Amino acid sequence: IRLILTVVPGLLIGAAISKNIANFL
Amino acid sequence: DVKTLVNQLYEALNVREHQLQKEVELTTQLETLQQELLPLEEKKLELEQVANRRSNWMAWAGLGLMSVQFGILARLTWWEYSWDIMEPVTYFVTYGTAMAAYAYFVLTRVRDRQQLLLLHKKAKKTGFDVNQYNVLKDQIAKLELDLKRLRD
Amino acid sequence: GLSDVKTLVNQLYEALNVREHQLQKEVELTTQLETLQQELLPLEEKKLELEQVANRRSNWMAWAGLGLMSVQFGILARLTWWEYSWDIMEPVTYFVTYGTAMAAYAYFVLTREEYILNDVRDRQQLFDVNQYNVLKDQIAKLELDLKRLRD
Amino acid sequence: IRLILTVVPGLLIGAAISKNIANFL
Amino acid sequence: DVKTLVNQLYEALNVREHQLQKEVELTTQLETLQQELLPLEEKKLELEQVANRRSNWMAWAGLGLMSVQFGILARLTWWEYSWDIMEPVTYFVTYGTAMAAYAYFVLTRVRDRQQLLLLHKKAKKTGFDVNQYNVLKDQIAKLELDLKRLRD
Amino acid sequence: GLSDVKTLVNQLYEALNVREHQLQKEVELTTQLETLQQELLPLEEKKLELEQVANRRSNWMAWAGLGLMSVQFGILARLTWWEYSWDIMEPVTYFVTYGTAMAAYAYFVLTREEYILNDVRDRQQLFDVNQYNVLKDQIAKLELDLKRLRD
Amino acid sequence: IRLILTVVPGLLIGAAISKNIANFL
Amino acid sequence: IRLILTVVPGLLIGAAISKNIANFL
Ligand SMILES: [Ca+2]
Numbered sequence A, D, G, H: 001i002r003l004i005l006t007v008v009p010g011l012l013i014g015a016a017i018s019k020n021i022a023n024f025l
Numbered sequence B, E: 001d002v003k004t005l006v007n008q009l010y011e012a013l014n015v016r017e018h019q020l021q022k023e024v025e026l027t028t029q030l031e032t033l034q035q036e037l038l039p040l041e042e043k044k045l046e047l048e049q050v051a052n053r054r055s056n057w058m059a060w061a062g063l064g065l066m067s068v069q070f071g072i073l074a075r076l077t078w079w080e081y082s083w084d085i086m087e088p089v090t091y092f093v094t095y096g097t098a099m100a101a102y103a104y105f106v107l108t109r110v111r112d113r114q115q116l117l118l119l120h121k122k123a124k125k126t127g128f129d130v131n132q133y134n135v136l137k138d139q140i141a142k143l144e145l146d147l148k149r150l151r152d
Numbered sequence C, F: 001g002l003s004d005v006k007t008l009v010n011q012l013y014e015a016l017n018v019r020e021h022q023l024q025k026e027v028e029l030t031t032q033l034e035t036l037q038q039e040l041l042p043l044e045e046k047k048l049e050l051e052q053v054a055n056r057r058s059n060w061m062a063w064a065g066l067g068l069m070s071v072q073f074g075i076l077a078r079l080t081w082w083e084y085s086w087d088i089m090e091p092v093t094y095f096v097t098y099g100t101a102m103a104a105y106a107y108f109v110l111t112r113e114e115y116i117l118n119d120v121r122d123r124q125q126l127f128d129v130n131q132y133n134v135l136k137d138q139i140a141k142l143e144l145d146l147k148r149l150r151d
Helices: A002-024 B002-012 B018-080 B087-108 B111-123 B130-151 C002-017 C024-083 C090-125 C129-150 D002-024 E002-012 E018-080 E087-107 E111-123 E130-151 F002-016 F021-083 F090-125 F129-150 G002-024 H002-024
Strands: none
Touching (some): A002 B018, A002 C090, B002 C002, B002 E002, B018 B087, B018 B111, B018 B130, B018 C090, B087 F021, B087 H002, B111 B130, B111 E111, B130 C129, C024 C090, C024 D002, C024 E087, C129 E130, D002 E087, E002 F002, E018 E087, E018 E111, E018 G002, E111 E130, F021 F090, F021 F129
């Protein structure tokens, strides 16, 4: 349960940060 | 000559009621040893848990980082860019991640006996002297086995 | 230390009392060795049983791992070469390989964490290998001394 | 013998399931 | 009383000439035990060398198979075909090699002491008992050490 | 066997001659502990020297490996992103990675083969760890007996 | 020395066998 | 500190050697 709660938020956080960095350029 | 002399000595000191004396002395020496063992054991258990939490946390963090890298690449090669332009970026990101894992390994550096020796070496923590705990466990095991023989 | 010298005098008395020191001691040595082996038998049986029960598990688990790897290979091979061309399914195979490596890593982390957490909990709440090993030592020393006495 | 009987059915099963899933879409 | 008895027995049997007698008895006991140990070392050395030949040969065969595959891929990827058609074959050949290596590592199945114990359990050949060998090594070690203390 | 029972009598005699049974025995145990430790020190010196001379080697070897891998990384990145395109440098990078992995495995097998050959040859031609080990065990038992005697 | 004598013949053997198999089709 | 001083020079050295080898052809 905790495994899913660790991975999935990390993946979504990675997506949003890449979104924002691409926005930044 | 000396045979009758050791016979007289046996009659004097070794009253020959020594069997039950051996039983009771054994079953109290065992308790004294266990009481002597418990502090060493609690030190070992605390040390093991403190060296376990670290590895657990580090492993979970490593999994989180792999997932974040996955997310960064999957949001790049399917929304912002095309696959072909981000093909070499992914290969070199994978290469760089492998190199960083290798660098982490190089920077961080009977099976139970090996684990305990390395833990004591990494500790230099007094109060738990591994060889003392080992000879203690060995003496206790031998004594308890002799008690099993005595009770029969 | 009175008990110590008492046991010492008893040992000395038994040693001087023996007749045929080189013969009768060899007989008693055989009896003692036989008795210790008969005592060891249950410990060895328990160890063998526990080893087998903990080994067939790992064999089945690795076999399942191989089956799953082959299943994934089959999925990729048909998709790449029958349904869609390779040019459109290059990213899918890369990211599925990534997902598979992460799942393998996640399985190792789960088994390690679960096993070690279960062990520490059992140790904090609480087949003794130590007496079995001490028994092997005593019996090997006895057999060696018997060998030396025989020839 | 058992090795072949474990791998090959798995590979064929993977192919057929991928077939069916692609059919499904 | 009994103290005077053991004093008389000390003068009787414990002649007290046992100092030099102990030195010479020990320097011969050590040779005796070493002569006893030798066959065990021969058996262990032979067994370990036979189990090492096999590992070397298998690792060399592995390297040979690795290089042959690399050769085949290179020739097709630059002479007989183009890179476009040989990307999926390359990836799937790498996948197949990984699966085969894993199938091999599954069909095969204090650090030195663990290794020796596993080797003995796997090979299980009579004439060499690791336990008697260990206890003999430890007894001869303690005797050499005591002899060092005596020579001073 | 007569010498053995004589040694039993000798132990008995050293036991009976004691004055201040627990005090002088505690003193003698302290001297024994001191003597064994003074003897143990040279072995620990040898072990620490050997461990360090065997640890720095692996550290430097791993650093060299990491540096070489970084050099290859840099080579591939510059050839891929500036001079050429990824379309033309795909097979080159794949086969260079293959070659690097094969060379690493070849280096491992070569050091393994050389090490085992040298070790078996030296063993056939021929810091005693086992006397160090029995020294640690004996000195620990003595320190433990001293503690139990203290209180 | 032996390392070279193991790898290089293997690579050449791989090339020739791939040659022959392509010839075969 | 030493980690950076090991990696970065290696990467730059790799770049320059690839430069020179491409120059060579
Ligand atoms: Ca490609």
